[PDB]
A paper describes a structure:
Full-length constructs of Aim18p and Aim46p possessing N-terminal 8X-His tags were insoluble, but truncating the N-terminal mitochondrial targeting sequence and transmembrane domain for Aim18p and Aim46p (Aim18p-Nd70 and Aim46p-Nd62, respectively) dramatically increased solubility. We also generated point mutations of the CHI catalytic arginine—Aim18p-Nd70-R123A and Aim46p-Nd62-R107A—to serve as experimental controls. Each protein exhibited robust thermal melt temperatures ranging from ∼48 to 67 °C, indicating stably folded protein. Interestingly, catalytic arginine mutants lacked this golden color. This experiment revealed that Aim18p and Aim46p coimmunoprecipitated with bound heme and that mutating the catalytic arginine significantly reduced heme binding. Alignments of the Aim18-Nd70-R123A and Aim46-Nd62-WT structures with the bacterial protein revealed that, while the α-helices differed substantially, the core CHI antiparallel β-sheet was structurally homologous to the core antiparallel β-sheet of cytochrome c'β-Met. Of note is a region of the Aim18p-Nd70 and Aim46-Nd62 structures that lies in between plant CHI α1 and α2. This region contains an extra loop that is absent in plant CHI domain–containing proteins but is conserved across multiple ascomycete Aim18p and Aim46p homologs. Nearly all of the CHI catalytic residues are substituted nonconservatively in Aim18p and Aim46p except for the catalytic arginine, which is invariably conserved in fungal homologs of Aim18p and Aim46p. Although our data show that the conserved CHI arginine does influence heme binding in Aim18p and Aim46p, it is most likely not the only heme-coordinating residue; future experiments will be necessary to fully understand the coordination environment between heme and the CHI domain.
Saccharomyces cerevisiae possesses two predicted CHI-like proteins, Aim18p (encoded by YHR198C) and Aim46p (YHR199C), but it lacks other enzymes of the flavonoid pathway, suggesting that Aim18p and Aim46p employ the CHI fold for distinct purposes. Here, we demonstrate using proteinase K protection assays, sodium carbonate extractions, and crystallography that Aim18p and Aim46p reside on the mitochondrial inner membrane and adopt CHI folds, but they lack select active site residues and possess an extra fungal-specific loop. Consistent with these differences, Aim18p and Aim46p lack CHI activity and also the fatty acid–binding capabilities of other CHI-like proteins, but instead bind heme. We further show that diverse fungal homologs also bind heme and that Aim18p and Aim46p possess structural homology to a bacterial hemoprotein.
Residue numbers in the entry: 83 to 321
Write the structure that this text describes.
Amino acid sequence: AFPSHTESIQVDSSVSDFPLTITALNFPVSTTFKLLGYGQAHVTFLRFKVYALGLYLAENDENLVSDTLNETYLHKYFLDVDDSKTPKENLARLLKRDDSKSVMMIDDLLDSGMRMLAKITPVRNTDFKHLKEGLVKTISKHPDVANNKDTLAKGLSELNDAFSRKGSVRKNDDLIIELLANGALQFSYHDSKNNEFEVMGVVNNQLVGKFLFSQYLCGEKSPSPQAKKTAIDKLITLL
């Protein structure tokens, strides 16, 4: 009769709240996802706001953080461990350093089979071309692009075909990007005016989803600094 618990948060007041939990009954996704980080995304020096971003982690994959980033990882890949601090304190410190070693850590997490969602909600009317191009720009900032140029190019072509729908996207619509355990991407669209979902294409090339979500979580110039900041803090609590 009297619901008393908050299940969503207002990432940006111009669009609808982001749910803390996304299940296969709410969206066309494969498992239960929990909000990890969130924030607004801006572009260019004019700080032009383009969308609100929600990053989600599969509930059943929360164990993968500590299974991957542990005291073994720490001494295997770092040679500057402060022995006065615990392993989790050192791992947290190194993740917050926000340097090339932080990227390595996030990339290793992504290789562990960690399943994720990105919910992208435009704050103005746009179109699928611009959403797609924004993902390409993000992917292209990953530090390892130059060492995987040809394979990545094949993946970016898959990304074009994955955007099966063409045309307008309304403010407050949702693009849903799901990262599968194997690294593939599944795309989906939510028409919020008519409350209709359209499943779109897939990208099976692993580099695409790996580079995209790595840049969301730890990019030097990430699309949403606040989503990066909140997601990293939340990942640290799972150590």
